[PDB]
Write a protein that binds this ligand. Structure first.
Ligand SMILES: [C-]#[N+][C@@H]1[C@@H]2c3c[nH]c4cccc(c34)C(C)(C)[C@H]2CC[C@]1(C)C=C
Ligand SMILES: CC(C)=CCSP(=O)(O)OP(=O)(O)O
Length: 293
């Protein structure tokens, strides 16, 4: 079956990359969501957040108007009460902004980590009326304006990290210059990457900003870049990129990949890479940012 092939590929990724994982957690996740993984925008992610350690997440999105993952996880026990503002945040999001898609993210050592909300691109102001958002979000209004973070294309709730992300379509011409990325990173006293990386960031169609309930500042931000196949991934920049690009499983022979370039105070600076397991994620990314496939 597809679902068994997916589960096998996921375990094999975790073994090959030495990622921590729990067979019992994988069982919970697949009992809840394995069918969803066979039928929708599924991806396997590795990232190198922690020191000399790769973590593995599995994720999916589908074009439903309602947050089916929240219902499945609550009914399944994969999502329990947190005693925290995250408890209702997803619900608020779907009540406050119409959704054209949803998705969910799972750490295979843990369980459900995040749920997300994909509306049509709307002005970021529509987020400020979500009650349970951390206060730092509405406090960054002038920040969003200045850096052309006006076109909100997604929201995520991170139940494990106790954080939320706002995602922006990076449509503005200034976001086509490297000085934009040096500026936006410097404004938070984040690490500035090499010139080559910056030359990669100028093409990014999507910028994520992470807020939390423990500081008034931005926790991290992330720049997403898609690549149509294994070869066009900048494999020379980091060994995890090379290895995952060359060895990641998919139901296609030469699948595409989504690379997130994350930046923070220094931790927060690292790479994430997702394999387009079914071939749907990358055309979705381009289409959702009004770009030719
Ligand atoms: C395209 N797409 C959306 C997501 C997405 C947006 N940006 C990303 C950067 C990195 C990774 C992903 C995404 C994932 C794999 C989570 C995508 C899954 C399909 C979505 C939900 C559309 C139906
Ligand atoms: C990008 C779409 C909205 C869902 C992906 S959630 P993410 O990978 O950006 O979340 P992290 O900040 O990396 O934990």
């Amino acid at each position: 079956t597809i679902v068994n092939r997916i589960r096998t590929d996921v375990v094999n990724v975790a073994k090959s990359f030495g990622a921590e994982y729990s067979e019992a957690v994988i069982d919970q996740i697949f009992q809840g969501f394995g069918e969803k993984f066979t039928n929708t925008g599924f991806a396997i992610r590795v990232q190198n957040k922690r020191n000399q350690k790769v973590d593995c997440n599995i994720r999916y999105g589908e074009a439903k108007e309602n947050c089916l993952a929240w219902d499945i996880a609550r009914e399944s026990g994969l999502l329990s009460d947190q005693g925290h503002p995250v408890d209702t945040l997803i619900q608020e999001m779907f009540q406050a902004i119409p959704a054209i898609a949803y998705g969910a993210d799972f750490d295979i050592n843990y369980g459900l980590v995040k749920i997300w909300h994909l509306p049509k691109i709307v002005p970021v102001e529509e987020a400020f009326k979500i009650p349970s958002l951390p206060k730092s979000v509405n406090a960054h209004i002038d920040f969003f304006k200045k850096y052309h973070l006006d076109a909100l294309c997604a929201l995520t709730v991170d139940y494990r990290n106790k954080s939320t992300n706002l995602y922006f379509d990076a449509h503005h011409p200034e976001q086509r210059t490297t000085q934009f990325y040096k500026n936006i990173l410097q404004s938070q006293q984040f690490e500035v990457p090499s010139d080559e990386v910056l030359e990669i960031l100028v093409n990014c169609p999507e910028i994520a900003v992470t807020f939390n309930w423990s500081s008034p500042g931005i926790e991290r931000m992330c720049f997403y870049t898609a690549f149509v196949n294994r070869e066009t991934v900048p494999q020379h920049i980091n060994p995890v990129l090379k290895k995952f690009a060359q060895e990641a499983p998919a139901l296609l022979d030469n699948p595409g990949f989504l690379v997130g370039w994350s930046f923070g105070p220094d931790k927060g600076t690292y790479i994430k890479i997702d394999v387009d397991y079914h071939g749907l994620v990358v055309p979705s990314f381009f289409h959702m940012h009004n770009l030719p496939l």
